[PDB]
Amino acid sequence: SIIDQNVQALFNEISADAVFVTYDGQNIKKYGTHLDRAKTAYIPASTFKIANALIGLENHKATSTEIFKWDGKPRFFKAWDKDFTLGEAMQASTVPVYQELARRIGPSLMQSELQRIGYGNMQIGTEVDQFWLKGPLTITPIQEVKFVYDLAQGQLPFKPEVQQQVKEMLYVERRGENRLYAKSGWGMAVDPQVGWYVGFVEKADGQVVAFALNMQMKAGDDIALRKQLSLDVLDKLGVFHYL
């Protein structure tokens, strides 16, 4: 309709190849400049933290209260040179913390868990703390959006309390009773570079609309555009109106 047109007109100023997928538990909808991106597999990059935390908590490798202490070695972002809980590292997207969690899980368990939940192509290669950053693990935007939709509903094959704890690690903001949850990603090690913004809007009436922005990134791109574009789309859709 006109909302589709308003949504499309947003992407018609973005030069990068982009797709935006929505899922309400019944219907996949696709918007953007390159719709075949929705069916194409990319590395999850930092959106893998969602499955990493779930796997770690489910298998008693971490708790949501435990402090991952900094080891004194200066990290890429200086905002990372500190101690973190998993939720704190999620919202700061502190890769070293989630690499430490992956090493605690181990390649054997990480592999069987990824096969057990059917996450992307379920490939980890031989480096348990790099597979979501450099490959070989890949996932399509439709897989991502169906993944976080099930998270929102607590219907993933994990303990209910584990799903709840990881879910609230993703909480961004609320407007009225509508809640936004989201995780961004920028995979820089692979060619082309892939940018993510995945999440879901939950309304008070139990209803969930999950979403996945997926677009090509290049060095020098605006770090805030992924979230900005996504919030604009959700506003034109009337899923998450601006205040």
Binding site for ligand Y33 (CB under 6 A): 45-46, 93, 95, 133, 184-187, 223
46 is annotated as contributing to ligand binding: yes
Residue nearest to ligand Y33 (CB): 46
Q: Please say which residue, 50 or 234, places its beta carbon nearer to ligand Y33.
A: 50
Quote the least distance from Cβ 229 to ligand Y33, whole Å: 13
186 is annotated as contributing to ligand binding: yes
Q: Please say which residue, 163 or 193, places its beta carbon nearer to ligand Y33.
A: 193
Is 230 one of the catalytic residues? no
Q: Please say which residue, 15 or 112, places its beta carbon nearer to ligand Y33.
A: 15
Q: What Å distances lie between residue 82 and 66, 73, 198, CA to CA?
A: 14, 10, 26
Dihedral, 92, 97, 99, 104 alpha carbons, nearest 10: -140
Q: Please say which residue, 46 or 165, places its beta carbon nearer to ligand Y33.
A: 46
Quote the least distance from Cβ 184 to ligand Y33, whole Å: 4
User: Taking phi first (over 0 means left), then psi (-120 to 50 degrees means alpha), and beta for anything else, what does residue 56 get?
Assistant: alpha
Quick count: other Cβ atoms within 10 Å of Cβ 42? 26
49 is annotated as contributing to ligand binding: yes
Candidate list 1, 46, 108, 230, residue with the active-site label: 46
Quote the least distance from Cβ 179 to ligand Y33, whole Å: 21
Dihedral, 126, 143, 147, 210 alpha carbons, nearest 10: 140
Amino acid at 226: R
As annotated, the active-site residues are: 46
List binding-site positions for a beta-lactam: 46, 49, 93, 184, 186, 226
